[model samples]
Target chain A: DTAALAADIVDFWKKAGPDKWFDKDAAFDNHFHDRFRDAHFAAARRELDGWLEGAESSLALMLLLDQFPRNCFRGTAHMYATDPLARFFADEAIRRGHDQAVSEDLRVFFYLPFSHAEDIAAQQRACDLNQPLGGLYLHHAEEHRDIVERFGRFPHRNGILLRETTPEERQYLEEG
Target chain B: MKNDTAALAADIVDFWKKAGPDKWFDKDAAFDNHFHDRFRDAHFAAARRELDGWLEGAESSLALMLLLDQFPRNCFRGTAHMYATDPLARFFADEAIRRGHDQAVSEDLRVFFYLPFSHAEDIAAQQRACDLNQPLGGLYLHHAEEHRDIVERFGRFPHRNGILLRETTPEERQYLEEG
Candidate 1:
């Protein structure tokens, strides 16, 4: 149930223009934000609670958790938590370590929460996973790692309510 | 061919990182200096030609375009001026320009052209293309236009002056405020 819902959401954006969705708030608001209210995502979370207990390695369950914060909470506390899905995949990738899963957009999306939340351990795992994906993903991983290194947190959050920073912490924001 | 070239791009990234020039501009400088060194620009130029040939053949049209976009941008980062000299980069831009001028455009093509280059004229042209294409992601085009406005008023990257290189001059600052 949760996996199907998640796929529907991805499909919505995919069909609507995934590339354009994040380009601006208006497009994002019109196509995605207006549709995915807190209630809509919470229903998905409700399904996840029942499914997560024995599904530790389930990619379907992982997609629900990964997509929730990434699409719903965006730059909020949604970013701050530990994502077992990312950890699970990262560990698997590290254990085997190759590019077999490069085309999995969900796998890439799983890394984003760690990147934004300042989870260095998970972010490292994400970077490790991205290494074999090549080009864009690899470059994106570099940017994500640099984000954590420079600020120890997503400094972009300074603009949001979830986290605040000192003048020194705000230095990079002004610099670049 | 897709997997082979993607793998090749990864290898190239590894080689460049090991060489370690620090940033995109620095990489551009190294690329300019090491034209024929066996371990330097020679490998990059060769890889670029291979990628270009694949693009010409339209082997994997979308994948090849994406690969070209990602590989070159990785090499030069977002330094548009640096990319203007590369054959593949020019091809991507020229294709976007032609498609855009002809009223048939793809979102991927627009993004590929816009991401690296920030020249004022190009930005304005892209802005026009986005208006015509009217893509859902038009906000990116809006932001690029905003950047062009800044450049037009100031004559160069005002934000870069103070931090990346030098501070803006007083005369330039006044123009930035007024224009």
Candidate 2:
């Protein structure tokens, strides 16, 4: 009975699109996935890359992005990656990357392959082949899809087919 | 349809706990009521806490075991774990980018369990992760709980018991260095 919520989420992501991201049915996935998608292109990997480079600039960018409140999502207590779990990475990856020196490879996983959505399928494909990259990919989708389906709707940056957002727009939503 | 080994383990655990000792397994009634009574949210919450707790602690190597705790059970869980064969990989990449934490998560760790339950429909989802040499995680087995005997008998990972088991966190260097 409870698992039906999961199905509803999968359906929302499958059905969600550019225009109707905030549609009552698709909102939660829209919000989570949109934020997730935006974070991916706008902040996450590159931010982590910054950490690898030992640059505080990207760290600030990532942290600023991370600072947005996930309290509502977390308050719901859904308890999966869908509920702003990515923030943790956005907050820490940069410093960790710097420590490891494999930062370039990690950056490539998120930036080079997609680098602003070259091909959604291709991007996903690379992640599929890449292990650690693959886990992050899986984690986001699960949480995003479920959030949209089970909760309220997503308003901005709904993950419509290859939806794109400028860093500015992301910041607006992030701090808003 | 996706087949989750952890879910299988949970089911096996559930059945055994519910039905009581049988030819195939042993069921415990008291434990069953306590286990099933919790909401899916509770199960996933526990799983996340377990996983992140270890990560926060820096158990990079044993944290890989965290994968075992995310297995899909009968709940409204979500994550990229749902996508079919090809999407499985993308799901991981997307998560790293979106979440921005692959550095800590280790590019080598396989997080297939975090995906949708349906992902199991494609066996490629299983083989492909390994083919890339990406430190494959466990599979969603139909008889996964059956394997519990091995863990119970031999003892597995550092953590076990409860709805599932994971490791202590902030990351552990032991497995990464030794492994």
Number of the top-ranking candidate, with lDDT as the measure: 1
Candidate 1 chain A has its poorest 10 consecutive residues by lDDT at A51-60
Interface RMSD of 2: 17.6
lDDT of 1 by residue, A79-136 (tens): 4343554455434443443224333443454454455446677567667766654444
Enumerate the candidates' DockQ scores in order: 0.06, 0.01
- Model 2 TM-score is 0.20
Residue-level lDDT tens digits of model 1 in B1-179: 23424544444445434543234222344453442232334234444555443333222223333334444444444465333444454455555454442223233233444443443234454445345334423334455555555566666666445444567888778755765
Sort candidate 2 into its docking category. Answer: incorrect
Off by over 4 Å in 1: A1-4, A38-40, A43-45, A50-102, A159-168, B1-22, B25-179
Task: Give stretches of model 2 more than 4 Å off.
Answer: A1-56, A66-130, A133-137, A141-176, B1-179
| For model 2 chain A, the run of ten residues with the poorest summed lDDT | A108-117
Q: lDDT scores for all predictions?
A: 0.47, 0.32
Each candidate's TM vs. the true structure? 0.47, 0.20
Clashes of each: 1, 52
